[PDB]
Amino acid sequence: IPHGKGGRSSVSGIVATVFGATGFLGRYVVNHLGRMGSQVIVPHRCEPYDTMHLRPMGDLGQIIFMDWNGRDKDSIRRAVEHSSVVINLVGREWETQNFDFEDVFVKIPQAIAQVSKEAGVEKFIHISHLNADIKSSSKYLRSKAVGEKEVRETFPEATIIKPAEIFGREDRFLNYFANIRWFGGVPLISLGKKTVKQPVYIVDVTKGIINAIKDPDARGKTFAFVGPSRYLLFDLVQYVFAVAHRIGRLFEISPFEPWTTRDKVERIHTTDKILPHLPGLEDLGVEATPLELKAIEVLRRHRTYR
Amino acid sequence: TRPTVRPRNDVAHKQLSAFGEYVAEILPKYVQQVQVSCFNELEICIHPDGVIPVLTFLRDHSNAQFKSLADLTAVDIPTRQNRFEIVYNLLSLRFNSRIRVKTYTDELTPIESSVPVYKAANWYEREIWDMFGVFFANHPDLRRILTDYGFEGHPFRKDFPLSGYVELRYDDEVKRVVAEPVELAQEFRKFDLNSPWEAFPAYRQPPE
Amino acid sequence: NLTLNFGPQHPAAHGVLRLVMELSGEMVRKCDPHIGLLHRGTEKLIEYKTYLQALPYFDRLDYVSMMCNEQAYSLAVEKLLNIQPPPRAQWIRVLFGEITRLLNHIMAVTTHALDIGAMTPFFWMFEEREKMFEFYERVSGARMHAAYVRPGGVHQDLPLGLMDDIYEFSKNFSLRIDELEEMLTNNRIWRNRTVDIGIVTAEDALNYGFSGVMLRGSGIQWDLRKTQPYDVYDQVEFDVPIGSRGDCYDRYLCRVEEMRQSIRIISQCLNKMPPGEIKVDDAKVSPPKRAEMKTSMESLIHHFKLYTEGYQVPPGATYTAIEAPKGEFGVYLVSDGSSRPYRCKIKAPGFAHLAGLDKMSKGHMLADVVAIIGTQDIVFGEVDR
Amino acid sequence: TYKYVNLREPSMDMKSVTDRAAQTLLWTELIRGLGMTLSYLFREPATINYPFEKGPLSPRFRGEHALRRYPSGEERCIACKLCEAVCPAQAITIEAEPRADGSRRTTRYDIDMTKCIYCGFCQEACPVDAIVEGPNFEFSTETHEELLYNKEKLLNNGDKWEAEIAANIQADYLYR
Amino acid sequence: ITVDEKLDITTITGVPEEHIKTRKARIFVPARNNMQSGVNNTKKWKMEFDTRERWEN
Amino acid sequence: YRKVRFVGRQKEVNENFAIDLIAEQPVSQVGSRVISCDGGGGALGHPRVYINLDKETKTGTCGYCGLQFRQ
Amino acid sequence: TSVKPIFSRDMNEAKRRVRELYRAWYREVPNTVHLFQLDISVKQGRDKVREMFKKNAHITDPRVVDLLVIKGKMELEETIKVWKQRTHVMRFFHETEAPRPKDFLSKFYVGHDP
Amino acid sequence: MELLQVLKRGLQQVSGHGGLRGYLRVLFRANDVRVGTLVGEDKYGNKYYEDNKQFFGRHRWVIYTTEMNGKNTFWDVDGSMVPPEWHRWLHCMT
Amino acid sequence: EYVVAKLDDLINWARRSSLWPMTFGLACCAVEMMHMAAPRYDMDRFGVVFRASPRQSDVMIVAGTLTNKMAPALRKVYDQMPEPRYVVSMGSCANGGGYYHYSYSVVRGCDRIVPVDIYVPGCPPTAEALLYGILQLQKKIKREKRLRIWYR
Amino acid sequence: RFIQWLRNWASGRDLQAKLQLRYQEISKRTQPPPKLPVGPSHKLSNNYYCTRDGRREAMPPSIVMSSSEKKAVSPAPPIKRWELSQDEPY
Amino acid sequence: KKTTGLVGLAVCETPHERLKILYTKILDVLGHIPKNAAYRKYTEQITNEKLSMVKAEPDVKKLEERLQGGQIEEVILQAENELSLARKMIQWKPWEPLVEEPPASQWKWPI
Ligand SMILES: NC(=O)c1ccc[n+]([C@@H]2O[C@H](COP(=O)([O-])OP(=O)(O)OC[C@H]3O[C@@H](n4cnc5c(N)ncnc54)[C@H](OP(=O)(O)O)[C@@H]3O)[C@@H](O)[C@H]2O)c1
Ligand code: SF4
Ligand code: SF4
Ligand code: SF4
Ligand SMILES: [Zn+2]
């Protein structure tokens, strides 16, 4: 039950559990959850130091840290046995040198579609992507839609969220551009055909979750994230060099965190403005952000004044 | 009466009864009350029309040097119909004597400041502006000392509560250190301490 | 003109005091510093406490003085309460009140000689300073911050010892002050580093309201140490130093002779202490003893009530000041008539001693300005008055 | 009284300038003085090897909180609340209750070891001499969430040792 | 002199934030804690404001 | 509800209790009227208090003393 | 009123002073927005300037407005120079604060009438 | 010629206690190399050496050896491993 | 692997063998650290050198009491530190702000601004438990860099 | 020894005022149990309240306020000067 | 002597007549004030008391006694400002009676 103002040091009733939560998306969401005040239970994988910058968001006693692998069961069960809701955002890009990378979007959402669901949770929310389709593209883009249906058997009502491409501060897609200081700046691939997708802004992403976390009645009715106005152009790549004026890796360097001349280069150039009959963002309001105002912030190059 | 009682003296109680008497005699324009403390102190209650010249009279003489400006303070008193109370304290170098100047005022009514009369009031006079809002007249540089840049409170009066409203916190929402309404972990439990039965006979009020 | 703020820089000294410099090429001619890095809410905070409970917040007002602060408080309270303190107690307040001056006047030279940049006189004297904190721990309660002086005189008696220790300590100290005489006085470069710097000697050196040294060592003979008594403090013999001109090097040479006075007074105070009691006997102010608050009936009711509320102070304003080892120490303690005091405004040095940095600085270099500051001996947290 | 230091007119004659001329020109100063007072290096370094060696203390030294009890365990505390009303930081919070035997005891007992300003007045306010500032500086945990001491630290912390505590009171209670 | 006698009911603002119109004060007499019979704690009017929620931390 | 904050923290708890440890004392007896109780030793412990022992042979542990006192 | 004023006399030395420094703010809003290296649009700053002046327009008494003049002028001393290190200027905008409900049915589900 | 008259004092002081293994094992923790004359009794293997009454602050030094309550061998000691009876003595309180 | 995990017993040993601290002298907890610099409990040459420029730091130390006029200046210096950093705050007024705690203008905690790892309690911690806090910090470094990219 | 007198040629010769008190002739311990005298009129039959009136002193005496060949009396006699402390005033 | 003790002044130059002008400099300006305030009654009293002992006797050191200032060059400054004091006594009017009596209960201390 709630009490008083939710400025800080309140209760607000809810008890969530956010896995992953070390990347760009999962950190910034929880930084709202410790503001209204709740028992945020965040288990991390293998990183005691990489959560140090996380702690000064929850006040005192509100956050807690645990260890878990994911291919184990009870480490994903012992933590979640006392909560109310649970979301998940776990996953990444290219296949590890040790992992399997296919079932990580299949059995790992199923590993928390285990007794976890049976224990008595509700409003379990997974993430999707707007472009994850069952078609033969790509090795990473498809095999995400396999988890969208084969795991949808479990949790018959979820409201699995479907975001478009996101832009914020430290993502990969927008920082894939302007990290291309090279002997040639080529677009993908010297063509202005499909560019671009829908870059929804990161405040709208974290605002959609907190409205849905006690909405109510948002289970099963899956939602889609609208982007900006409206599709986007080829001008974006020229918009980079115009205004820019042309975490547990290793001790020295990681040997392979590459630009990946593989199916990475096509997972973004496959836009797929999908079905507008999903409700999915404006009804889970209110999210309305342009691009031209937030572009000064993330871009940072040598001029810095003019 | 006994040991462990302070032995008072009458010599300093005599001359300080003597010296301050002919002060009101030679300026019956500004002086409205003089009183002698029972432990060799003197108050000269002054309506603040004569804020400059009486100091200027004590600035120099041949029978009263008094050129050591020690203490400018400020005391608020609610339920007086003129709240505040500016109180000086100055020192005679050649004579070893303490005397204070009690000048009342109100909030909006300004006071002619002592800037040409003394140059030790350069940082003291600004402090009452920052803490109360008592706008002194004709100061060359009025600014903000000993408070933070965004306050609107003038905190040393009584209506300003113990904590402010401005408990500060950090978030990584973008970069900023943002303000927020104030939230404590504990009440500051306020006690109740005034015992009854009136331990003091001498200061007994007019019983009405 | 370049507007550098050489201050917040944690360049040794005391990384604080952030100010501006509107320098005219090389000379400064305009200095307007900012203060308020520690305001702490002190004078508002005391308005909810009682007299005994508010007492350590006077102790933490310096960094250095532990018995010279709270000396300016109990003596600011005992006048209101018509009490003279008992005679054995007064010989201890002069003893520790003339031992804290052997902590400021060691720190006031070494820390000045560190901004300047000398390394070795910082380590050559604090290693001898350790022989003195063992006293503080042996007598009161802690390393530095001791709630030791009470309004009812001394808290408790110092144990067996501390008389063949202080006499052991003080008989081997003048050799250590003869070290720094060889280190700085006869040297030329440090003399050349400070002569004719900060020549402030006129009657605006007193119209700025300065307290001692950056007084009398520049001229005008006056002090609060033998024109105004405290306790048994006039019954000892000593003299007060005066320097020649009005610069820093003739306020530096006060402090060498000042430490050569505190050794005499300690070697004069030990010969004159009588045996006696500790507290004031009438027990409406002092708590009764521990062996008494477990036997009689009268002891507990004048024990159990004396900690729920405090004393009963009569109304009427008061004021006093004593010799802090860097200046006067004004306390204008407004009393109301209950266990909880009314307004408690303090005057500390540094209000005068650093507002007059405007007059003192100009016409000079930028490297002069850091050498100015360690001569007035300004400590922050103490400018919170 | 007076003393006029650094007040001495120079010599100004034929021979005594040669003492002030050999000083500047050939540096009989600054080496006889400052090169000998530094060396002076042969003295013994007075350093404490802290994990092995330890320094001196006093029998009245303050530190960690603890609670005592009588011979065979009685909870010497009587919950008379006096340590609460004199704590300057209000680090004490006590809720009491009549225990079913009849004598009153405590239910919650707190010391805000963050807020605790160590005025030690709790040691000098208990009539039945319950709380004692135990002389052990063993500290430094890793969270803010841990240093708030509940009761079942303090009775345990008062019973990791007692002979350390019981000898210091018994050597000091005659003074106070 | 510049006396310029004029008339206005002095209502000062800007110093707090919003709690002018929100709250309502109360002026009363504290009257004899009746565990005992000392009447010194009369003769002074006091104030106290609105009381709002106290939850559990 | 609160049971999640100590997972892997082992719940450091007290072992002995003074809820009932008076009852294992050899309850004292005198056969007189009024007795001192400076128990725990003189000038320490609980203060002096005098108890009437006439009525169901006991005193009532004096509150302060704690030890069961009777005749 | 047996009290001398500060600067103004009656309402006409007053209302020309509040118009006066408004231009000093008005050329300042584009001047500082590239100086303090923060990124919003500049028209939002000009809206917030006139936001502050218009709200206190319910005064029918001199020397209070004149008291706000001294408050209004002292704001420019830190502003024209650099005495507010990228935070105090951002303190004007209640940005990351959660919205107050201000609606009766909305207050009723959350809160013991705050 | 003082390189041998104090070296005869230091020769037995270095070599004549434990030999080569008892010297090199205690060497690899600190410069605490001068062996104590008088010994203590308590408790485990931490014989609190009381020196020759020619020091203070460094006359009652202690030795940490091995695994008081399940710790590592030799290379992690916080100094809190002393029993809470020596705090009367190791701090020089009596 | 036995080959690769042998390497971080040098690197995670080397960082806990040379720490170059910054000190923020603000209040009375600054003075006691100077006595740790004084050669009784000689702070130098037990792994750790004396003062150092603000650029080249690993372990920052906040001592004393924070005011709202210092809360911006703390974060800016905290950004300029390199990556394997640690925050250790001594003094009871850096753990909840001691008392002064109910005052209108004191930062409540020195934890709602920077993330701090080791909390030494006390008005002045007596330069005796503070070397104990530093040996706690080197004891805290039992972390690994290998078997982090070798696992994931 | 030969390293000894090199300390005695440099900066004088002291040999006794060492910077450590760690050697002998530092006071080690003190034996006896203390007992405190209780002196200042703690006794009975004359030591008695309403004689010791340490509190209850009256109001500050008001001198002539609102509602003659005087000698223009100073607040105090002026400060007479100082001696010169005949040890070495130069 | 070449240093005047109190640093910041200079012995400049002649005693016994630099003073003797400046007392008589005040006494002529003293007659200008309308005589109803007793300011004249005490200020002319002490200057005639001073100048009678001032004029005109050796030595400088004897004039230090029976004239309780600092050194004799500083005794100039004791009356230097007093000349600047009495000429502004014509500008404002302290001989006028009291103005702005306080509203009948203000200087009562216990609230
Ligand atoms: N909305 C979009 O536009 C978008 C774009 C690209 C990708 N995504 C996907 O949506 C989520 C956004 O993630 P992000 O932008 O914040 O970057 P991210 O670094 O991938 O964050 C997701 C978290 O999953 C963790 N993780 C990866 N594999 C794991 C495993 N086997 N077990 C446990 N944790 C694992 C990652 O590292 P740790 O193991 O250290 O916790 C990371 O902390 C991810 O699932 C991502 O694949 C979304
Ligand atoms: S120490 Fe005293 S006041 Fe505190 S809990 Fe124990 S009996 Fe009660
Ligand atoms: S130890 Fe200090 S802060 Fe804690 S309760 Fe006792 S007096 Fe108060
Ligand atoms: S209370 Fe602690 S942190 Fe604050 S000034 Fe005193 S010693 Fe320093
Ligand atoms: Zn008993």
Short mmCIF file of N, CA and C in Angstrom, two decimals, chain C residues 10 15-16 35-42 44-45 49 57 60 62-63 111 122-123 126-127 129-131 133 143-145, chain I residues 22 24-28 31-32 34-35 37-40 51 54 65 67 69-70 77 99-100 103-106 123-124 126:
data_model
loop_
_atom_site.label_atom_id
_atom_site.label_comp_id
_atom_site.label_asym_id
_atom_site.label_seq_id
_atom_site.Cartn_x
_atom_site.Cartn_y
_atom_site.Cartn_z
N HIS C 10 43.09 22.27 -5.05
CA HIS C 10 43.50 21.57 -3.84
C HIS C 10 45.00 21.59 -3.75
N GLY C 15 42.50 23.23 0.62
CA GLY C 15 41.69 23.41 -0.57
C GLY C 15 40.29 24.01 -0.40
N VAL C 16 40.22 25.31 -0.15
CA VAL C 16 38.97 26.03 0.02
C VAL C 16 39.20 27.50 -0.30
N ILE C 35 33.38 33.51 0.51
CA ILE C 35 33.36 32.59 1.63
C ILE C 35 31.97 31.99 1.73
N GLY C 36 31.85 30.97 2.56
CA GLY C 36 30.61 30.25 2.72
C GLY C 36 30.68 28.80 2.32
N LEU C 37 31.88 28.25 2.16
CA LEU C 37 32.03 26.83 1.86
C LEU C 37 31.54 25.94 2.99
N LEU C 38 31.63 26.40 4.24
CA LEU C 38 31.03 25.70 5.37
C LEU C 38 30.24 26.73 6.17
N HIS C 39 28.94 26.77 5.95
CA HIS C 39 28.05 27.56 6.79
C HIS C 39 27.35 26.73 7.84
N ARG C 40 27.05 25.47 7.53
CA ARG C 40 26.73 24.42 8.50
C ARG C 40 25.45 24.61 9.30
N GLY C 41 24.80 25.77 9.21
CA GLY C 41 23.70 26.13 10.08
C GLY C 41 24.01 26.06 11.56
N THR C 42 24.94 26.87 12.04
CA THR C 42 25.36 26.74 13.43
C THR C 42 24.48 27.54 14.37
N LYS C 44 21.61 28.92 14.04
CA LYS C 44 20.20 28.56 14.12
C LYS C 44 20.02 27.28 14.93
N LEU C 45 20.99 26.37 14.85
CA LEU C 45 20.88 25.04 15.46
C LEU C 45 20.83 25.07 16.98
N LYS C 49 18.52 23.47 21.60
CA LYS C 49 19.27 22.66 22.55
C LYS C 49 19.19 23.31 23.92
N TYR C 57 29.40 22.09 20.46
CA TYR C 57 29.38 22.77 19.18
C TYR C 57 30.17 24.06 19.25
N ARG C 60 33.94 22.26 18.40
CA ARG C 60 34.22 22.01 17.00
C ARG C 60 34.23 23.27 16.16
N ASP C 62 36.75 25.74 16.24
CA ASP C 62 38.09 25.81 15.66
C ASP C 62 38.41 24.49 14.97
N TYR C 63 39.67 24.34 14.60
CA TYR C 63 40.29 23.05 14.36
C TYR C 63 41.23 22.68 15.50
N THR C 111 52.28 25.26 8.91
CA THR C 111 51.35 25.30 7.78
C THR C 111 51.55 26.53 6.93
N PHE C 122 57.70 20.84 8.60
CA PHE C 122 56.38 20.30 8.87
C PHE C 122 56.48 18.97 9.61
N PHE C 123 57.48 18.16 9.26
CA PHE C 123 57.63 16.85 9.88
C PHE C 123 58.51 16.92 11.13
N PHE C 126 55.66 18.18 14.08
CA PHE C 126 54.48 17.39 14.44
C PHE C 126 54.87 16.08 15.10
N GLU C 127 56.10 15.62 14.88
CA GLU C 127 56.56 14.41 15.55
C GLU C 127 56.81 14.68 17.03
N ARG C 129 54.80 17.01 18.40
CA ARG C 129 53.44 17.34 18.80
C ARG C 129 52.68 16.14 19.35
N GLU C 130 53.04 14.92 18.93
CA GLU C 130 52.42 13.69 19.41
C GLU C 130 52.57 13.48 20.91
N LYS C 131 53.63 14.00 21.52
CA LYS C 131 53.85 13.94 22.96
C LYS C 131 52.85 14.74 23.78
N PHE C 133 49.12 15.10 22.62
CA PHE C 133 47.79 14.52 22.55
C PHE C 133 47.59 13.37 23.52
N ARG C 143 40.71 12.10 21.35
CA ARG C 143 41.91 12.66 20.76
C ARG C 143 41.93 14.17 20.87
N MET C 144 40.99 14.85 20.19
CA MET C 144 40.96 16.30 20.23
C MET C 144 39.70 16.85 20.87
N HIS C 145 38.53 16.50 20.37
CA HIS C 145 37.33 17.25 20.69
C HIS C 145 36.77 16.74 22.00
N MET I 22 43.63 11.58 -3.11
CA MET I 22 43.30 12.97 -2.88
C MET I 22 42.59 13.12 -1.54
N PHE I 24 40.21 15.94 0.72
CA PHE I 24 39.43 17.17 0.70
C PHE I 24 39.33 17.66 2.14
N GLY I 25 40.26 18.53 2.51
CA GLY I 25 40.23 19.11 3.83
C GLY I 25 39.12 20.12 3.95
N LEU I 26 38.11 19.81 4.75
CA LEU I 26 37.00 20.73 4.94
C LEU I 26 36.71 21.06 6.39
N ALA I 27 36.97 20.15 7.32
CA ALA I 27 36.55 20.33 8.70
C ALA I 27 37.56 19.63 9.59
N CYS I 28 37.16 19.31 10.82
CA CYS I 28 38.13 18.83 11.80
C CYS I 28 38.66 17.44 11.49
N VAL I 31 42.41 17.51 10.09
CA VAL I 31 43.59 17.72 10.93
C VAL I 31 44.18 16.39 11.38
N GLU I 32 43.34 15.42 11.71
CA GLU I 32 43.80 14.12 12.15
C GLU I 32 44.51 13.33 11.05
N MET I 34 46.45 14.74 8.90
CA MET I 34 47.79 15.30 8.91
C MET I 34 48.68 14.63 9.94
N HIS I 35 48.13 14.20 11.07
CA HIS I 35 48.92 13.44 12.03
C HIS I 35 49.22 12.04 11.53
N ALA I 37 49.88 11.71 8.36
CA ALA I 37 51.04 12.10 7.57
C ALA I 37 52.26 12.38 8.43
N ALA I 38 52.06 12.80 9.68
CA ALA I 38 53.18 12.97 10.60
C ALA I 38 53.75 11.60 10.95
N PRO I 39 55.07 11.47 11.10
CA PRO I 39 55.68 10.13 10.98
C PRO I 39 55.54 9.19 12.17
N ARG I 40 54.62 9.45 13.11
CA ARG I 40 54.28 8.43 14.10
C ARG I 40 53.64 7.22 13.43
N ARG I 51 50.34 13.55 -0.86
CA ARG I 51 49.44 14.31 -1.71
C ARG I 51 49.83 14.16 -3.17
N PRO I 54 45.32 16.62 -8.82
CA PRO I 54 43.96 16.07 -8.99
C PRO I 54 43.78 15.15 -10.18
N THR I 65 32.44 17.96 6.38
CA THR I 65 31.01 18.24 6.26
C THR I 65 30.79 18.93 4.93
N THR I 67 28.55 21.16 2.25
CA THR I 67 27.49 22.14 2.14
C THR I 67 26.98 22.17 0.70
N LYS I 69 26.79 24.60 -1.26
CA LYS I 69 27.72 25.34 -2.09
C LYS I 69 28.93 24.52 -2.50
N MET I 70 29.05 23.27 -2.08
CA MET I 70 30.14 22.42 -2.52
C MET I 70 29.68 21.19 -3.27
N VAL I 77 35.03 17.21 -9.92
CA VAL I 77 36.30 16.55 -9.66
C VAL I 77 36.12 15.04 -9.72
N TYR I 99 25.90 15.02 13.40
CA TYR I 99 24.92 16.06 13.57
C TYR I 99 25.48 17.23 12.78
N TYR I 100 24.80 18.37 12.86
CA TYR I 100 24.44 19.28 11.76
C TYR I 100 23.42 18.64 10.83
N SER I 103 20.15 20.44 9.80
CA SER I 103 20.34 21.82 9.41
C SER I 103 19.87 22.05 7.99
N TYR I 104 19.60 23.31 7.68
CA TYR I 104 18.94 23.65 6.42
C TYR I 104 19.87 23.54 5.22
N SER I 105 21.19 23.50 5.44
CA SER I 105 22.13 23.59 4.34
C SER I 105 23.33 22.67 4.50
N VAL I 106 23.12 21.41 4.85
CA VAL I 106 24.18 20.41 4.87
C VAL I 106 23.72 19.20 4.08
N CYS I 123 33.43 11.05 14.98
CA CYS I 123 34.14 12.30 15.16
C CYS I 123 35.53 11.92 15.64
N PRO I 124 36.54 12.73 15.35
CA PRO I 124 37.65 12.27 14.51
C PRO I 124 37.98 10.81 14.70
N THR I 126 40.56 8.18 14.88
CA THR I 126 41.69 8.69 15.65
C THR I 126 43.04 8.48 14.97
#
